[PDB]
Design an enzyme around this catalytic site. Structure first.
Site, PDB file in Angstrom:
ATOM      1  N   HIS A 101       4.118 -12.640   1.088  1.00 52.24           N
ATOM      2  CA  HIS A 101       2.893 -12.243   0.407  1.00 52.24           C
ATOM      3  C   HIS A 101       3.105 -12.239  -1.100  1.00 52.24           C
ATOM      4  O   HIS A 101       4.194 -11.924  -1.597  1.00 52.24           O
ATOM      5  CB  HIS A 101       2.383 -10.875   0.883  1.00 52.24           C
ATOM      6  N   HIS A 103       1.752 -10.492  -4.534  1.00 53.20           N
ATOM      7  CA  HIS A 103       0.980  -9.430  -5.172  1.00 53.20           C
ATOM      8  C   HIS A 103       0.313  -9.984  -6.425  1.00 53.20           C
ATOM      9  O   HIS A 103       0.922 -10.763  -7.165  1.00 53.20           O
ATOM     10  CB  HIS A 103       1.909  -8.312  -5.654  1.00 53.20           C
TER      11      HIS A 103
END
Ligand SMILES: Nc1nc(=O)c2ncn([C@@H]3O[C@H](CSP(=O)(O)O)[C@@H](O)[C@H]3O)c2[nH]1
Ligand SMILES: [Cl-]
Lengths: 115, 112
Positions: A101, A103
């Site tokens: 992922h 951010h």
């Protein structure tokens, strides 16, 4: 169950709710539940990759797509003064969910060093 | 406008180069914030991630794959943090896209 059973795999399959910003066939952008900046969201692949250290060479376009989606979402969210993108790898990186992922943090001055 | 990273790509000023190919360059940061702190930059002058084009997608992903391979070669087996800064709030220091890779210590939260 495609995407795996981490929290993020379950969010991908709409089994756990999230505040979704953008979705396509490759990725999903949604707000972070514990924001570290006034705006703090995540861009994740729908394909399950545990961590950046194990990404394949053929994952290049997908990883780049996370950043393109991240910058488009940041503009759509009005982050006109800028933002910071972060990937955490492993223990020293602070990684707590083993589904890749990105951010995106903004809406305040970010400081240096980045943690 | 040219930047100091353009000079580094052109080999006009020195840097401690870790890896190079036809489309990117990785080198140690001159102001390191961790025991290992290097940059991966495209040779194409993209000034900032906010202006990257859709056709740049594979190249941006290439920076991350190169970054993770360099991190492994530099012995960062306990992990690391990758960072792209955009604009003034992001703390972007040079207007040439660059991926920071930091490790060799515990990275903290928040990330700045
Ligand atoms: N929207 C959302 N729903 C969740 O159910 C959840 N569970 C964790 N998270 C965020 O994902 C990052 C993992 S820590 P990392 O692996 O990125 O170091 C941290 O910012 C969490 O607040 C979540 N976000
Ligand atoms: Cl920077």
């Amino acid at each position: 169950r495609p995407g795996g059973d981490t929290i993020f795999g379950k969010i991908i399959r709409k089994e756990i709710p999230a505040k979704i910003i953008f979705e396509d066939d490759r990725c999903l952008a949604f707000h972070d539940i514990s924001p570290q900046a006034p705006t703090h969201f995540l861009v994740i692949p729908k394909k399950h990759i545990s961590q950046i250290s194990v990404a394949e060479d053929d994952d290049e376009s997908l990883l780049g797509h996370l950043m393109i989606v991240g910058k488009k979402c940041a503009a759509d969210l009005g982050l006109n003064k800028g933002y910071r993108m972060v990937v955490n790898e492993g223990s020293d990186g602070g990684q707590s969910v083993y589904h890749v992922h990105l951010h995106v943090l903004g809406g305040r001055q970010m400081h240096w060093p980045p943690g």
